[PDB]
Amino acid sequence: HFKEYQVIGRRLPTESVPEPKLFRMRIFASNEVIAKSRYWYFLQKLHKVKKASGEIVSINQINEAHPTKVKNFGVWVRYDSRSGTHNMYKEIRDVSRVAAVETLYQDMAARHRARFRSIHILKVAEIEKTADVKRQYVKQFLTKDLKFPLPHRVQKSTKTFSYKRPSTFY
C-alpha cells in the first residue's frame, strides 16, 4: 500500500549562495524513508547533485481531498525497460490519487514487467469534463444508468464437503 509525500530540497546553502531554488515534487511511496530515497534518485536525473550535497527541507503527507467521490485520473508515466526508456499515458477511474497510482503499479507489473525502481510517476491529473477521456475502457462506465450482472459467482466454501451441488446464480 502507498501514501503521497511532498518533498523539498535545496543543495545545502554555501557562502555567497544564500537560500537556493527549492525543488518541489510529489512522491508516491509506502513509507517516509522510501520517499526520501526516491527523491534523491529523481534529483540526480534532473540535474547534477548528490545525497551529501543536499538536504531534505520538509517531507509532509498529502491526504486526498474527497475520498468519497469517484474520479477519472489521467496519469503520465516514464519507465525503464529491456530496451531504452519511453514515455506513456494511461487512464484510471478511481476514488483517490493514492488508490489510482496503486492500481497503476499493479497494471504496469502485469503488462510490462516494470517494478517500482523502473517507474517514474511524471504527473497525476484529474479529468473533470467528459469527452477528454481518450481511452475506451474508462469511457465504458460513463454511459447513463449502467446496469450489468456478475454471473457465475464463485462461492467460497469453508468446509470441504458440500451436500447440495452448488448452483451459481446471482
Binding site: 468519497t68 467521490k69 469517484v70 477511474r93 478511481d94 476514488v95 488508490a99 462506465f141 447513463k144 444508468d145 449502467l146 446496469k147 450489468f148 450482472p149 456478475l150 454471473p151 446464480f169 446471482y170
Partner: protein, 134 residues
C-alpha cells in the same frame, strides 16, 4: 407465441442494495452508489453505519431489492431515498433476512432455553403426528 424465458439475474446498478459478507461492516446493508469498474463498486449505507468506500464485489453479495437513486449520490441524498423507499421494512419482510435473524437467534440461546426448545419440539411433534395417518 414467442416464449423466450428467462435468465433472471441480480444486476449491479446505481441504487442496488447489497449485503456485506467480509469486512468490518459484516452483515450490514449498503447501496451501490457508483460502479468503478468490472470488479469494484462504491457503496454506502448511512443508516446501518457502514462508511463510504471502494469495495471489491467478492467481498459483497447482492440482494433482490433495489431503489431509484442518482449516479454518484452523496451520503445525505442516499439517506433520503433510503427512507423514502423504506428498504429496511422490505428487507426484514423477506424470507432471507428471517434466515439470518434465525441463525443469530439460535446462536445466542441459553442452555436452559435450548432445553425449552427440546420440550416444546416433543409437544409439537405429538400434534403433527396426530394430524397424519388419517
Amino acid at each position: 407465441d414467442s416464449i423466450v424465458k428467462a435468465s433472471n439475474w441480480r444486476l449491479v446498478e446505481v441504487g442496488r442494495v447489497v449485503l456485506i459478507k467480509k469486512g468490518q461492516s459484516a452483515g450490514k446493508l449498503a447501496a451501490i452508489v457508483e460502479i468503478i469498474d468490472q470488479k469494484k463498486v462504491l457503496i454506502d449505507g448511512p443508516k446501518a453505519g457502514v462508511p463510504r468506500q471502494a469495495i471489491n464485489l467478492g467481498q459483497v453479495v447482492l440482494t433482490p431489492l433495489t431503489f431509484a437513486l442518482p449516479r454518484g449520490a452523496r451520503t445525505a441524498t442516499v439517506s433520503k431515498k433510503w427512507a423514502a423507499a423504506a428498504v429496511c421494512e422490505k428487507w426484514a419482510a423477506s424470507s432471507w433476512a428471517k434466515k439470518i435473524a434465525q441463525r443469530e437467534r439460535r446462536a445466542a440461546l441459553t442452555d436452559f432455553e435450548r432445553f425449552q426448545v427440546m420440550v416444546l419440539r416433543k409437544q409439537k411433534r405429538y400434534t403433527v403426528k396426530k394430524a397424519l395417518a388419517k
